[PDB]
Each structure stands twice: as structure tokens, then as C-alpha cells.
Amino acid sequence: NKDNENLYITIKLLDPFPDHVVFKDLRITQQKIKYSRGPFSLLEEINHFLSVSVYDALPLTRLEGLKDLRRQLELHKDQMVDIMRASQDNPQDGIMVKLVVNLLQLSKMAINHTGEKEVLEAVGSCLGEVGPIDFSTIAIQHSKDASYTKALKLFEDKELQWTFIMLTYLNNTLVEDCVKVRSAAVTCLKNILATKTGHSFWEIYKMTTDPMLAYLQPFRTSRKKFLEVPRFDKENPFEGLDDINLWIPLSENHDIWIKTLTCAFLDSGGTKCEILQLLKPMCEVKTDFCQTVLPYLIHDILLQDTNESWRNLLSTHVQGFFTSCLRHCCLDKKSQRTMLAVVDYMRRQKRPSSGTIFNDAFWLDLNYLEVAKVAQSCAAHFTALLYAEIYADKKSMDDQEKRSTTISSLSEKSKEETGISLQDLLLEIYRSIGEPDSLYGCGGGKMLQPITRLRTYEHEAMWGKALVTYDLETAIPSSTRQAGIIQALQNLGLCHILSVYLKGLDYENKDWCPELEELHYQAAWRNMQWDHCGTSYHESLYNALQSLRDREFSTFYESLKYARVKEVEEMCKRSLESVYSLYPTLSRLQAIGELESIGELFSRSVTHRQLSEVYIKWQKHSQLLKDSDFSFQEPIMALRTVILEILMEKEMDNSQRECIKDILTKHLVELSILARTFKNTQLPERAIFQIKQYNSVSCGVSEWQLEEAQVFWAKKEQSLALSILKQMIKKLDASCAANNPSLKLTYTECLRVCGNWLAETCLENPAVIMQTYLEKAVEVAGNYDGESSDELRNGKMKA
Amino acid sequence: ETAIPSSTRQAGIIQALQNLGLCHILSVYLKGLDYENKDWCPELEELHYQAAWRNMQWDHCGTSYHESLYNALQSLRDREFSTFYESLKYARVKEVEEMCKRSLESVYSLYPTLSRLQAIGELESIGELFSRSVTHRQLSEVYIKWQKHSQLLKDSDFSFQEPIMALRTVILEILMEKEMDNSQRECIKDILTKHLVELSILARTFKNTQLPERAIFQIKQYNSVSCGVSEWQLEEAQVFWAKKEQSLALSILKQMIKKLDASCAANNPSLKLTYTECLRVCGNWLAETCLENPAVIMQTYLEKAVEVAGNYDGESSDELRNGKMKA
Amino acid sequence: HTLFIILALANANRDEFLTSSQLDEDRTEAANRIICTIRSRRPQMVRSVEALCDAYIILANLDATQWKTQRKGINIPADQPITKLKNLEDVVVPTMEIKVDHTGEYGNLVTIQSFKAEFRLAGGVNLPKIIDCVGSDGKERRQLVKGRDDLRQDAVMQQVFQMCNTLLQRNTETRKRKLTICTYKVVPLSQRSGVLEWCTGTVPIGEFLVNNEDGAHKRYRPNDFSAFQCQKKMMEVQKKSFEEKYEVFMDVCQNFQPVFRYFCMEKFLDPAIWFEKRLAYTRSVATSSIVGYILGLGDRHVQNILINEQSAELVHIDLGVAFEQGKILPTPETVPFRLTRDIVDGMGITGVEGVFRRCCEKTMEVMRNSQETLLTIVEVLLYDPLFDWTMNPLKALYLAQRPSFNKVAERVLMRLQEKLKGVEEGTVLSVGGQVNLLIQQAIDPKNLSRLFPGWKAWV
């Protein structure tokens, strides 16, 4: 059926078949169908992958598409720079962050399903190909159906929108395996379609084109008299809902709680809309339907509320539920999310009385501080922030009305009234959000507390102050005290000091918590302490490195696979709302991918071309990370340095290890430059020392000496840098005689930098500086006639 | 660097760690070094004894200087005065003998010896006070003598004054940790607080920030926050200001001012100086940071401090005269 | 990118043609020579663009004072030649921003197709006309045509804003924070008439806040003082003592609470989108305030600031007053920028603390690191013979109405250099200290009290 025009579009979009001999003919048929228009670029491949995603929610069928996307991301990294540059103007809808979100959603869908390990591994590899690239966005957005939104916009009446939502849900659940659910859905569909509202929905909705209209044709029937929903007048409609036990049973049974609450709402006589009354059989078989319909039932009750009796009853019961959450009791993370969704839905509805959005935010008399605290507990950071702002505004308005206060005073009143500090809650909300600038907005609370000071020092990269405070303070729990001490020591270098400190800590303490084992393994693999010898990340990395040294590739790949799966699983259970929560995971997956990629090079023969290509790929991907934070780039550079040093320490009888030595020297120079950019001085010094371990001083000087001089200049040591650069210039003058094209760039750059430094320090007259350094560099760059190069052009431009 | 000889490599590492505080880090580093190495050269034993007596690690237990000091401190704790005096005599004799064999041409070669002999003399002088009964007058006289001799050392380098202050702090803490059933240890607590405040000021003068923070922490260990604020809180605010943390120092000083305003009602002469100094310092800091208009700064801090210092009529004092002059 | 500028220079005196010093005639003759040189090889484009410019000038010269009370749209009279011209494939849209390519060939550019027959009017002293331009792609574009005003100063200010944007782009600290200045294309056509980009989807902050019919203050705080009452009270105390002005301003501020924070609440119901829009608004305000202080931007009243409905980013218009010429006004401006109660309230509960202060510090650091380039650009501007940036009594009275050049340029350059180096009152101030001083000066009620009531300090 390749020639079929109505089936060609859907055949083009199906997932590629697995790479096997049996699937050959279908594979060529699919590739020629898809590539009939022409070759697809990286952006087109990503767009095709995302269009395929919306069809079937089964992760097993997407394994081949995941591998194909990995291949395109691996061999089309050049187009990723153009893709990111094209999304700079509008980073909210960036295709890369959308792809990452879709992959993470697919991984979440793969949890608790057969063949999940392969899907998680493929997703981890895909997220390892693209690292923690700065997406210029803070909030994670989810893809929404444009057709569904347009259909919602078609209906103006709220009841018609409710009818459309219920009918869409019933159509969606009609394909479920359960037969009782299908029967209930069919009965509800017939009941809704038999009412007058269903008929009006059909008349309004028949203009548009939608398969749901065709699916609902057999259920619809034409009758002279419209179906009448009986209305019963209860003697006291409030007795069903006025029960504190009914609202909070909380016996670790959320399904029966939501079912009983929905049934109690349904049997109440307050409901006026006809379609909601007929949803009881569908509600009694599905808890998700009950959770979906509960906000609609509450809204319908409040619309018909008279004398504010229902409003007061719902306000006091919801407030009691929220207080029972705050307590310490021990509620299920589903009930809180359902109530948060109820509050969010009610916040978007217009009240019958004329008013603004602020008035609409108070359908019920609720204390939004408690709701914000629950949302923060439920990891709804933006919702918690909005609720906290609403609560603060409402309390300020109430105080102004009563009288007819700063943040600290308002927090004190909140603490003395409800026991929750607004400033503290805003502090954890902003920390969870992770935006660096917002942390300074709410800092007046707990200023003298050592934890806040240490967090501020770590955020500002004040590692020395953090180490001093960690050593000084004792009341802080030990586990995080040595965790911070080790982190501060590592960030300042001090590898030998950190190793001795770890040895002494292990000597004085026998109990070993997982955090200290994690840090010990991190220091062991970072310091190449190979004599130390579920599994965690750094432990897996250390085991993989030892397997690489011992040429045990099977366990090396098994360990890398296990680490990738564990990282993806750990990322799946997070909230997935803040972009900053993805960066450590993306960096870890990138490091794992780089180690896996270099594994094949280590296994087979070592050649100059393969190492050059690997270094070029590393440099290109590092340039793709130019906007990433140093905390997400430093582990990658450390792993690259460890890998290169492991390659060099391998037995090398071919006498061609100079290529690896040069590659490591260039990598360490780039690391020194990157650390200098981020106002770091210990790491560039360590990199210079590592370079000097494998290198020496000869007649022909090299670039790392200039890098060392720049590092010494950055350390506010002007005399040392000037003396080093002057010695470099003297050696260049005595050595080269306009014969080495490679030394031309080094000589020109050294002369220009020395002249600029002398001009800045005012240690020499302008005449001598011009005669000796600047015009000399210009003459060297120009008169040598070593043209036809781009680096020479850049050097001449700078001079 | 690794090619440097190990003995001086860990000697420099220990010296750098000690000069930056990091007492727990230095202790763990020493324990790990002793774990990984069995040979023990005299330099490392000297540094280990120095850290043991400086950190009050009393469970570690010819003789050298710091070893003699540590032995004397343990003898002081155990009330073994005969060996305490014998150890101090031996340390003094050894120091003089070591100074005799030097060239004796450079004045700078005498300063470490003079500082060590001063520390030995101070420990010997406080030994008699420890041996006999503890009284307020004797402690006051000893503190006055210490302050006068420290003022005699106002031009000395910090490297020659820091060990003396550390020994004084250790001596005071040893006096406080002694059993005290007379309920008059508050005098020793106040003396130690004043000594630590002076140490913080001296370290701040020499552009040192870790030692003032350690002294503030030690003060906070033995002190708390009450309705009537004290001077060490102002010293802590000054230390935080010296650490280029202007927001923290300003917030601390503002809290101090609010507590003073709510607590005192022109009734405590002692709190008058603290309130005036806090107001003047906060006003100067706000003026430097340009975080407030001149009208509000004058109305709230400067003229308020002047009014507090003048209208309270707590005259006939020299500290009040200095505070009024500064305001 | 150059034909319109040369034609505008050559059409300095075509306003009275259609309806001084020797440098003027020399410039006109040189512009005519350049036009003939361009027309030598491509005559159809030059003729078409000249006809379009003449049509714009004729449309601008139309009085159209009868439809002042009409806000539904008036049909363009058939006498205007702009209706006759259609399908100008050789004229790129002046309103749109044309990307610059290294190659000399320009292709696939959006060209003018036709113009709608209906034009709108905007409020003001004079009556500008809003016309719609249809491009080759068929997408309508709104253009504002202004008369009896000089638009070259606005174009120069837009160029400086573009330079500030480019400086902010190449620094990673501000590129990460996406600190940009909203810009609109200004195309001067003569010494008296011109055309400029109309910011679609934007509303004045004063229109949103203190509108008489459906203002935010009236909708959210009916019991508070009305905008008219506050304006009348401020105008009454104008001829009074400074203390009386201060106490009147405090009394008005007591009965006028900011409600600008509700813009994001009523326009962005999603908490994630609301947070993104609020962060973008705070970053835009901080960056615009720092840029305005660096350039000495003045007359930043409610009607001169536009806010985008879609992106919640402030747009600054009417940039005629700059280089601290507002301090020379009869009522001096004592605030470097507008940081009124509504502006701070719209930043969230944290106010100026947090994102606003850090962004201001980053922008000031970027400005300081590029002091030489900014000083060179300002030197280029200040010696432009056609740049009438100096304040004159006529402009001073027009701005505030109620019912040696070399020495001045050198003083302005010295003041700018002191600002770039952190010198404020003869002392060296760090970036944080300077930012704190600017925030304190902007939010000081005493400085706001002295300001002109038309600036609406209480708003």
C-alpha cells in the first residue's frame, strides 16, 4: 500500500523497524517513503521525532527512533550550533528543550513497564549526546494539543465546555482493556447525548472535522422528547458534605476517598447541571475520572450557592484538610495534588459578581499560605510562589481594611498566627526554582544561621569562606559538614590534602554513610587512586575506569549502562518543572557518553586521525557548552583529563604518544582558560602543574608557558607574569630567525600581551613599549609573509 | 608541588592550615598523616604537639618548646605543680640555650625567642593564681597586666603576638573548665570575652578574617543573646563588615539597634556606650554604602547617638568622653 | 539601509514645496549628487522610493482635525497619492528591520504591496495618523506617521539602544539573563515630518493604570483616591513650600496604593508563564533604567513608556530628552529613572531586592567594561551638526506647560565619563554602591515630591 495517497502520510510517520535481516524490505520501503522529498537535517529529524511521539505512548516501539535520534545528534553536532542560535530570539519554544522534555516524559511513561531498561538506556544516551546547553529558560513547559484548545474555544457556554470535556474523556477511555469501564462509558455517552445539552453540543460541534463525531454516531438517537434528568429535593443537602471524617479519612486509601467524595457530591441536591448527574456510573469505576470531575462539581455547586452556605462549608472543610496536611497527618501525595488542581481550576473561573482576577482567586475563604506550603511539599514551585504572593496581598489588604508592614513583619505575623513563616517558605521556593538572582530577594530571614551563610558562599563560589565556616561551626549535622568540607576542598584543588583528610576521617570513624562513600569514590577516581579497590554514579565511574585500565570492556560497558539507567531513573522521579534540575543530569550523561565513546578508541588500535577527530568533537561540544555554568562543565573537563592521562599511562611502544601528550596539553590549556573566565585560580594552577609534569622547557617555547603567564597575571601577581613573559620573549628572539611559522603566532601574542601589561602597569615609557613590543609584533606578523591562515589573521587583527 | 622535600611540605601545610584556623581539618590531616606514615621526624612531632595544645587535645598523652608547653598545660589541669614548674624551667633554659648559639647580629632573630619567653612567663605567673584560691581582684590585676603588656606590644608583628593571645585564650578556657562551685565564674567568662574581642580587633588590624570569626564563635559558645546586648555582637558585626559582607553587618547592627531601643529606657549606663557606638557605626556604614538619604540617616542614627550620649547625663567618665567625641 | 537617509537629507525643505547656513545647501547638493549617482544604475528603485516618500509627506501634511473625537477609523481621502501606488516590488518596508548581509545581492525581501484605505488617530497635542502597510507575504504592518516634530533624534537614540543591546549580547553575564532594550524602527523623512514603527500589542502604562473609565486603580481600589483627585491635589500645592509639597505627596501616596502587580496575574494565569513574564518584566525594567541613567534619559512619564501585552517587556518612546537635559528644565528631574511605587510593586513581593538589583549590577558592570566604546559613540553623537540635543527655552516650555556648544558638549562628556567610572560626587563608588545610590535616589519620596505633577510620581 505504498502507492495509497491516504495512507502515505501515516506510513511516512511510523517508527523505523529494528535492524535485522527479516525487516529488510520494510526498512528500505520506509526509508524511501520518508526520504522521497529529500535528505533531512538535524532540525527536520528532531521535528519528525516529535511528530512521531504524539501518536503512540508505548516506549518499546520508540527504541529504533531513539537510536536514530542518537545517531543524528552524534554526527550532526555542527547543525546544533545553528539550531541554538536560531532559538535565541524566542527561547521559550526552543526545539532542544522541547525534545529533552519529551524524552523525559517518555522515560516517565516507561517506568513500571516491560523492557524499560533499554528505553531508559536509549534516552540516557540521547541526553548524553546533548549536554547541559543553556536553554535561556527557567520554567519547563509541556506540549498541549492545539486542536483541543481550539475546540474549547469554539464553545462559549461553560456547560457546553463541560460536555465536550466529558465526551472527549469518555471517547479516550473507550479503548481501554476493562469491559466494565467501557460499558459505563457507553452508558454515560448515551445519557449525555440524549439530553438537550448534548444535542446543542452536537449542533455546534458538527461544523468542525473530528473523528469523535463519527465515533459517537451509533450512540446518538433522535427522539421527540428530550431526556429528563430527575431532580430530588433533599431535606438537608448539607448533611452529606458536613462531615470532617468524610473529607479526611486518610487511611492510606486515596481511591476510595476520592470515590466516596465524588459520590457524596453527586448525591447532593446542590448540583444543577444535568450532565454531571449522569456521570456517577463512570465515576464509580475510575478514580481518574473522579479527580477530573471534582473541580467541575465544586464549581457547579458554588455557582448555585445561596446565602454562601455551600461556600462557607467548602471553605472550612478545605481549610481543615490543608491544616491536616500541614500537621507534623501523613497524607497521600495524590490527594494533595488533586486538591491543588481543584484550587488551580477554581482560580481561573469568573465569579458571578462583577470583579477582577484577585476576587476570582477567592471562590472559597482559604488561607493561601497553607496551600502554597502544600504545593511546595508537592514540588509545585511556581504554583507555591503564586499562592504565597496571593496570600501576602490578601493579608495586606485585610490589614489595611482593619486599620481603616515589611516582609519580616509579615513573616512574623504569619508565624505567630498559623505557624508558617512566609519568608522561609519563599526561601525554599526560590531555592527549588534555582534562579540565581531570585535568591537575594528573600535573604533577611535567618541571616546569622550558618546554613544560609554556607549556601550563600557556595552560590558565590566563596569556597575558602565556606570551608572556614564548615570547620568552625559544629552544631551542623556531621554528614553535611564533611560533605561541604570535601566539596570546598575539591573546588580549591588540594587533592593531597583532601585524600589525607579522607584517610583520617575513615581512621577516626567506622560507620560509613553513602554520602561519604560517594565523595570518597569521587576523590579516588578524580585523583587516580586506583589502589582503593546499589552502585552509585561516581562508584560506577571509578569501576568503569578500573575496567578500562584492566581492559575488561564487558564490565566497563555494563557499569556504564547501569550508571546511565540509574541516572535516568533518578531524574524520572523528580518534579520536572525547573530547567536547572536537568543540568547536573545532562552533565553526568554527557560524561558517561564521552567515556563510552572513548572506550572503542581505547579497545582498538590508537591512530592520529581517531584522536584528532575525538578532540575535534570534544572541542565542538565544549563550544556548545559555552553558556553553561562552571559547575556543569568542570566534571566533564576532569573526566577528559583523567581519560587522556589513562591513555598516556598505557604502554606505548610505537613512540607516537606525543600526539596524546599534545592533545592533553591543549585540553589542559583550554581548561585553564575556562577556569580563568569563571574567576578561578586554583584549577588553572593545577592544570599548569600537570602540563609541566609531562612537558619541559626547550629552545622553542610553547603556548602553555603563555597560559601560565596569563594565570599568574590573573592571580594579581604582575611582577611574576611580566618576568615570565619577558623571558619568553628573550627566548623567542634568540631562538627563531623568521623560520618557524608555528612560533610566529606565539611570538606575536607574547609581544602584544607583554606590551599591554606594561602599558597597564605604567612600568615603561610609551616610546620604548612601542619600539620593543607593539610595532615589533606587528612587524613579525606582517613582514614574515606567512600568510594564508586564519589564526595569523586573528593575531594580526589583535596586534 | 611534590618535588619539595616532604618534611617542609607538611610543615608548610600545617602552618598554613593553622594560620587560617581549620583546627578540625588540621587535626584530621595530622591523624591521616600519622596513619599513612610510621616514621616521625621531630618537626612533625613539634607541630602535632603545637596543634594538640592549641586545640586542647588533652587525650594525646630532649623535650622541645611546644611539647613542654603541652606537658605544662596537662600538669596544670592535673594540679601537678612541681612538674609544671620543672617543665617551664626546662623550656626556658632550652630556649635561652638555643638563642645563645645563634649569630646575635639581627634584631629580628630575637623576636620569636622574646615571644616564647613572654608566653612562658605568663603561664608561670598564672600558675600561682591557679594554685591558690580564685578571687576577682587577682583576675582583674592579671588582666590589667596582660592588657598593659599587650599595649607595650602594639608595634610588634602579628606573628609574634598571635601565640601569646592563643596561650592566653587556652589558659582562660582551662580556668573556666575547672570545677567552680562558688558560682563566680562569670568574672572569668567576662575576662575571656574581653580577651577574645581584643584578639578579634588585633586580627582585624592585621587584615586577618579567619581568626576574628573563630574568636566570635568561641565567644558565642560561652555567651547567648539577651535583652541587654553586649560588645561582642558589635565586634562580630565589625568582623562581618571586614569580610566584605556589608548586608550581613548592616542587618546585624540594625537588629542590635532595635534591641537596644526596645530594651533600654535611659537606665543602663553600661548600655549607653554600646548604643552610641552602634548608632554611629551604622550611620557611617549607611553613609558609605549610600543605601539611605542623608536626612533619614541624620534623623535616625547620628543625631540620635549624639542625643543619647549627651542628654542622658551619665557624665564623669573617660569612655563616655571618647564616645561623645567620636559621635 | 542608506537611500532613505540620503533622501531625508535631500528632502529637508520639501514639506513646504509639496504644500539657512551654507552647510544646509552644501549638504542638500551633496545628497542630490548621491541620489543621481544611485539613480544612474537603478532608476526605477530611486523613483519608486521617492514617490513613496512624497506620498508619506503628503499624508503627514494632512490636517485632519475634524476626526479628533473619532476612534473607530477614518477612510483615507482619495486625493492622497499613497492610495494610487501599489505593488512596489523594488521598495523594502521601511518599518521592518532589514538584516545586513556581507554579500551585495539582496533577495527574498518583504516588499510593499499595498496600503489599507482606513487610518487611525492617536491622542496628543498634534494628531498622528496610523496606517497599515501590506507586505509581499500579505502580513499587515502598522506604521505611525507623525508631523510637526523631529524624528532624527529618535532614530539616533534607537541606534544607541541597538549599540547597548549589542554590547549586552556579547557579555555572557547579560546574555544569560537576556538583558535587552526594546527597539522600534524610526525612519525620518524630512525636517518636519517622518514615519516610525508602531509597537503592536503594546499599551501605555498610564492607560492601563490610571485610566478614567477602566483604570487598574479604579477597578482594584474603588475606595482610594481617583487619579484626577491626586492630580488636582498635586497641582494645588505647586505654588507652595517644599515641606507642604512633601506632606501632600505623602498624603496622596497614603491613599493611593500600587496595583500594577495585577497585570501579570490577570494576563498570565499559568504560574510558570506568570513567573516567566514577571522575571522578564523585572529584567527589562532594570536594564532600561540602567541604560537611561547612562544616557541621561529624561521625561519618562506614564505616556512615554509602553508595555508589551504578550511579553510584558517595557518599551521606551519619545526619547527626545537625553544627556540630563531634563535637569536643565524649569522643574528639574531629580531621579535618574522611573522607579515609582507601581514599578516596584510589579516586580513582586521582593521589590527592588533580588532580580532587579542583581540585573542592575550586571548591566552597570557591562557598561563600565565598555566605557571606551560608549564614550566614543557619545562623542560621535555630540559633534553631529544635525543633532539638536541641547535644551532650548521653547522646548523647555513645551515640555512643561500649564493651563558655547563646545563647552556644554565637553561637560556632558565629562559627566558621562564620571558615570561610567562610578564617580558621582567626586568619590569612587563600586558597581554595587552606585546601583544602591541610584535605587535610593529613584525611590526617595522627597525627590519625587519636587517633580512635575504631569510626570505622575505617585503613579
Ligand SMILES: Nc1ncnc2c1ncn2[C@@H]1O[C@H](COP(=O)(O)OP(=O)(O)NP(=O)(O)O)[C@@H](O)[C@H]1O
Ligand atoms: N512607536 C510607538 N508605538 C506605539 N504607540 C506609540 C508609539 N509612539 C507613540 N505611540 C502612542 O502615541 C501616544 C502619544 O505619544 P506620541 O505619539 O509621542 O505623542 P506626544 O505625546 O504628543 N509626543 P510629542 O509629539 O513628542 O510631544 C503614546 O501614548 C502611545 O500610545
Ligand SMILES: [Mg+2]
Ligand atoms: Mg509622549
Ligand SMILES: [Zn+2]
Ligand atoms: Zn503525619
